[PDB]
Amino acid sequence: KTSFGSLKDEDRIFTNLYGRHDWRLKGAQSRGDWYKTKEILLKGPDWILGEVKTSGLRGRGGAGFPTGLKWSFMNKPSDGRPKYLVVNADEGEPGTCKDREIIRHDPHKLVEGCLVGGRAMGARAAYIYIRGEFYNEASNLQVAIREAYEAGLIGKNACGSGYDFDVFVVRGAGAYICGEETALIESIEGKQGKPRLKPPFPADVGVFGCPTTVANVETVAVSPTICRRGGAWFASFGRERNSGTKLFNISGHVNNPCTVEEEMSVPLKELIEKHAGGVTGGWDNLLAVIPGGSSTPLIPKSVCETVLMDFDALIQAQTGLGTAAVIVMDRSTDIVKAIARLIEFYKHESCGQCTPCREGVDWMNKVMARFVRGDARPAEIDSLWEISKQIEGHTICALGDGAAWPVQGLIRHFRPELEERMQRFAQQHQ
Amino acid sequence: PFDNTTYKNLQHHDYSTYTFLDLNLDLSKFRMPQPSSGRESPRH
Amino acid sequence: SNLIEVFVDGQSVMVEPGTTVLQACEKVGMQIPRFCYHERLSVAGNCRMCLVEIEKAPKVVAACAMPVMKGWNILTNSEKTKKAREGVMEFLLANHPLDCPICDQGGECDLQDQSMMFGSDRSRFLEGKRAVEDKNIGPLVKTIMTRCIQCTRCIRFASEIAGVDDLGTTGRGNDMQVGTYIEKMFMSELSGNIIDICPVGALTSKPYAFTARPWETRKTESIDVMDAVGSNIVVSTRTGEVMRILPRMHEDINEEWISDKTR
Amino acid sequence: ALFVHRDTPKNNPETPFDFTPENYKRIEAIVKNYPEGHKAAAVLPVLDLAQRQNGWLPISAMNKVAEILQVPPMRVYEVATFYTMYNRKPVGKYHIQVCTTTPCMLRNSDSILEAIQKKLGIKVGETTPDKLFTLIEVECLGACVNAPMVQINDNYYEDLTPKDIEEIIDELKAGKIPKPGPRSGRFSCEPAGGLTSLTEPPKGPGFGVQAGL
Ligand SMILES: NC(=O)C1=CN([C@@H]2O[C@H](COP(=O)(O)OP(=O)(O)OC[C@H]3O[C@@H](n4cnc5c(N)ncnc54)[C@H](O)[C@@H]3O)[C@@H](O)[C@H]2O)C=CC1
Ligand SMILES: Cc1cc2nc3c(=O)[nH]c(=O)nc-3n(C[C@H](O)[C@H](O)[C@H](O)COP(=O)(O)O)c2cc1C
Numbered sequence A: 001k002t003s004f005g006s007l008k009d010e011d012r013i014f015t016n017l018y019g020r021h022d023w024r025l026k027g028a029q030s031r032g033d034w035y036k037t038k039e040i041l042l043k044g045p046d047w048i049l050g051e052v053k054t055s056g057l058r059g060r061g062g063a064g065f066p067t068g069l070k071w072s073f074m075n076k077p078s079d080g081r082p083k084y085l086v087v088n089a090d091e092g093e094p095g096t097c098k099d100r101e102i103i104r105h106d107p108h109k110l111v112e113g114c115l116v117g118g119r120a121m122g123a124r125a126a127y128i129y130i131r132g133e134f135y136n137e138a139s140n141l142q143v144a145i146r147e148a149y150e151a152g153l154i155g156k157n158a159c160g161s162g163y164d165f166d167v168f169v170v171r172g173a174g175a176y177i178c179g180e181e182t183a184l185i186e187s188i189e190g191k192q193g194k195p196r197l198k199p200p201f202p203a204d205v206g207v208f209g210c211p212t213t214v215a216n217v218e219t220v221a222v223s224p225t226i227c228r229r230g231g232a233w234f235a236s237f238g239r240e241r242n243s244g245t246k247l248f249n250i251s252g253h254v255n256n257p258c259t260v261e262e263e264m265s266v267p268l269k270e271l272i273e274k275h276a277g278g279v280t281g282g283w284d285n286l287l288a289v290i291p292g293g294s295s296t297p298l299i300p301k302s303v304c305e306t307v308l309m310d311f312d313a314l315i316q317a318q319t320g321l322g323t324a325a326v327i328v329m330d331r332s333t334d335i336v337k338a339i340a341r342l343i344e345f346y347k348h349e350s351c352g353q354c355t356p357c358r359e360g361v362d363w364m365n366k367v368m369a370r371f372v373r374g375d376a377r378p379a380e381i382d383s384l385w386e387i388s389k390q391i392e393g394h395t396i397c398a399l400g401d402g403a404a405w406p407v408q409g410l411i412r413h414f415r416p417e418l419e420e421r422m423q424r425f426a427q428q429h430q
Numbered sequence B: 001p002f003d004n005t006t007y008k009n010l011q012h013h014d015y016s017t018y019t020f021l022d023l024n025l026d027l028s029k030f031r032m033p034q035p036s037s038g039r040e041s042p043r044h
Numbered sequence C: 001s002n003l004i005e006v007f008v009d010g011q012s013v014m015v016e017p018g019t020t021v022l023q024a025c026e027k028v029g030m031q032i033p034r035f036c037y038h039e040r041l042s043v044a045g046n047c048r049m050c051l052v053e054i055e056k057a058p059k060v061v062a063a064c065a066m067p068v069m070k071g072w073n074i075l076t077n078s079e080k081t082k083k084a085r086e087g088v089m090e091f092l093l094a095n096h097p098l099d100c101p102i103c104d105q106g107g108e109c110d111l112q113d114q115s116m117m118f119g120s121d122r123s124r125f126l127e128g129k130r131a132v133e134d135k136n137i138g139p140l141v142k143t144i145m146t147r148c149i150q151c152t153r154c155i156r157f158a159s160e161i162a163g164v165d166d167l168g169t170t171g172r173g174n175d176m177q178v179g180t181y182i183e184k185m186f187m188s189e190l191s192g193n194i195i196d197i198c199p200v201g202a203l204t205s206k207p208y209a210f211t212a213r214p215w216e217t218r219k220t221e222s223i224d225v226m227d228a229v230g231s232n233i234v235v236s237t238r239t240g241e242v243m244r245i246l247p248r249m250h251e252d253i254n255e256e257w258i259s260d261k262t263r
Numbered sequence D: 001a002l003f004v005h006r007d008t009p010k011n012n013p014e015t016p017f018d019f020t021p022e023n024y025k026r027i028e029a030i031v032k033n034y035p036e037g038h039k040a041a042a043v044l045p046v047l048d049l050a051q052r053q054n055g056w057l058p059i060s061a062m063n064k065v066a067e068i069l070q071v072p073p074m075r076v077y078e079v080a081t082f083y084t085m086y087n088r089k090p091v092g093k094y095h096i097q098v099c100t101t102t103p104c105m106l107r108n109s110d111s112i113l114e115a116i117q118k119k120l121g122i123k124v125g126e127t128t129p130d131k132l133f134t135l136i137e138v139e140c141l142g143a144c145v146n147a148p149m150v151q152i153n154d155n156y157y158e159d160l161t162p163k164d165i166e167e168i169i170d171e172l173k174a175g176k177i178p179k180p181g182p183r184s185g186r187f188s189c190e191p192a193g194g195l196t197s198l199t200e201p202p203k204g205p206g207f208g209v210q211a212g213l
């Protein structure tokens, strides 16, 4: 296959994405959830890990680590400590609202994914660290978890398989860094959400000191569909090493801002002009697209014509796929104000632990706040470039990377506009 | 009959401030006994 | 023996499993710079001054916390190790106040000394610096929190060695402030050792304050007699007058601490 | 806005705070979600329960949470100052949170922020003198396709115009509660001009389930 996209409704994993069907247990069973879960649990951990490794599923959190290779790190005998699945449900990324829709409208798919994933890794329970701001979504998930305990689908003797598995929901308290996996693990432990260093990885020392996998909502909820439909079905979509379907969050300057599931290697132009009603003012009104959420660098309009919406094609476009949350910006946008507001986000959402993020992200915000007005001179663009390179790669987690990257994309694709901003400031203020 | 036009997620219009915690209190009886680290706290 | 072979700048050295990169470089006589690392405190890894290059590895590792894998060549003097050091020292000195003359840590400052040894020689910070409210933690430790570099040796000492658990970090981001969050008076029996392990002038000795300066002091090595521990001390004197009392390292007695009575 | 505390007559360790007995049962249920030996993991939900009881956190809820979990009080102070939901100041009864990050700013959240300001007569950070509304300006609330949006204490009010948010503030002043959803024609997150996807009926159980299962 060469052309990707136009995903048919029979291949949608996340049916009832829009709230149009019943989200509860009787509606989830009538759409395919909890079907033959006892057989999936009885076929063992190695079979489920083989079905995830066959499927080519990469981590939907945004980094794209291979899911079966990641979960096989827990496939080891116990050392006295319990094992845990921890389901990452924070989703603080600007642009991104897909995990909100999965928790809110398909909660039993997430709970069955907790059961299947924690079966595959020998995990005792599942801690769904949901975002604290998603209160109605968290109570929604708790109603579904009560329906799953009352039906015998989880808990003592889950689905009749003899494998005991609890599911807990831990609510956050308003910290974007508590979606980072080690900071999330520390936030579950009752501490400040400060990221641990790596190594130890969570498969060695995770939550409470136990072996742990931290996985996104979307990479957990697709796993019962992968284990029912087969890994070859899921690997039949997208390019090679870019398999599956992906939820896309098209927001910003589009006609119909939507959440949609689409095939993996779909073009960006096809996605925006099909599911979002196109850019406001036409495709010629397009200025730039932040492809996959705020951490990824933007791409200008010339790159958006041909680029595919998977990991490798966006890496070749010197950006990333990320959360696949498409932020569309038209020609009427002060792009320096938008990227400086994005860096203002990244200094308000920064835990202060290591020196490069704590100091340099505030310093990049001050330089970008001067760049909006133009209160600078064009040596400071290269200064800010080197400051972004000093933050990038030198931090504890990837929020330093995620703050340095939009500055780098803005400089790389809009240095002349920054320069003319500063020179009109210089001429009308002197 | 089949329907696709009505929004079925209307239950969150009637959640109060203690909905999550009352659901956790209800779910506390369905759960397994927790593992023990052998001590009461790391300061013990 | 289960010693693994690692390389510090190509020089072979046999280390125990569990050795960090910093200890493996210490075994060949090289001292990696650090601010949060202290060999008697738990590892924080939150100042990023120890970032060293492993060759054939496109990312600098935190040498205080990273265990050495077998066959690693640690490049302590390579170009991107030095770029990591100068960048992290630039961010450390970005919001740091220009207090070196009015600072008691001046001349014996780690931030000064390894800014000379590993930092650049000038600034690119054209912004306004921050100013942190000063905390009142007692009659012994003067606190000027604008000079804090948030290395959290405070919290680790008071949590682990002093056993108090009443210092911490409040806030978040660049507004993250080290303190007690309440008007609390940190009075342990060992409470003056946070003066020693503060690498910067954020925690100085309030009786010693403003009186002397380290180069003009004469370091005489003596014994504590305030108790029967026999704590080994340096009595530093200036022109026939006793100025302060610092500890000596003695692993079998007082490892590098003293009590507040001694101090 | 300050991450240090000073004793005022309204906020001191002798300020009366105590949980209600059903809140003690909910705290027991919270603590029984974590392993024995790690009762300190229940600091965030019990402190959030204290805030949902009291409205904000004086420094007696922090000390009570430190007492009933046997953790040091500084380790509750750290958590209360780290996370932005814990109100260390007494907020109004409807704590409006306008999201002004880039996907909401691109869809004109500044119009809604100005509308709330000229509707209430306050600015960002201030509380109305009848203690009903506190307006602050927050980061991404995770409702980006329903931009522009606000949050009023638990609920997302989405797809807003200034008329919509003035209507919401009006019927909050009337003692009623509005519906937590989009204020356009759409329901949650679909395209507004009809569904571009999921129009077919879902396939039900057993569709495409592989052999050997
Ligand atoms: N989904 C969201 O709401 C957000 C997502 N992100 C995404 O987060 C990404 C960065 O996340 P990270 O976890 O720091 O990225 P990545 O470097 O670490 O690793 C991703 C996953 O692979 C695992 N892993 C990688 N190498 C491993 C090894 N050798 N051994 C064991 N496990 C290993 C990690 O434990 C982690 O769970 C960014 O690319 C960004 O797109 C960022 C912000 C918000
Ligand atoms: C600052 C930061 C915030 C993150 N926030 C989230 C998040 O909110 N939700 C999420 O699923 N992953 C988030 N991640 C990515 C996680 O670190 C991790 O990769 C992911 O949650 C689990 O891996 P997975 O992709 O295999 O599911 C964040 C990463 C960073 C650096």
Ligand code: SF4
Binding pocket: A177, A194, A195, A350, A351, A352, A353, A354, A355, A356, A357, A358, A395, A396, A397, A398, A399, A400
């Ligand atoms: S880079 Fe920023 S987000 Fe990460 S540990 Fe450091 S302060 Fe925290």
Ligand code: SF4
Binding pocket: C096, C097, C098, C099, C100, C101, C103, C104, C105, C106, C107, C109, C110, C111, C112, C147, C199, C200, C201, C202
């Ligand atoms: S702490 Fe060090 S660098 Fe800072 S003012 Fe004092 S002597 Fe100067």
Ligand code: SF4
Binding pocket: C147, C148, C149, C150, C151, C152, C153, C154, C155, C178, C197, C198, C199, C200, C202, C203
């Ligand atoms: S006061 Fe000194 S020892 Fe304490 S955290 Fe700050 S720099 Fe480190």
Ligand code: FES
Binding pocket: C033, C034, C035, C036, C037, C044, C045, C046, C047, C048, C049, C050, C051, C062, C063, C064, C065
């Ligand atoms: S010394 Fe390793 S980071 Fe501080």
Ligand code: FES
Binding pocket: A093, A094, A095, A096, D099, D100, D101, D102, D103, D104, D139, D140, D141, D142, D143, D144, D147, D149
């Ligand atoms: S940007 Fe406002 S909700 Fe995500």
Ligand SMILES: [K+]
Binding pocket: C105, C194, C195, C196, C197, C198, C199, C200, C201, C202, C203, C204
């Ligand atoms: K000092």
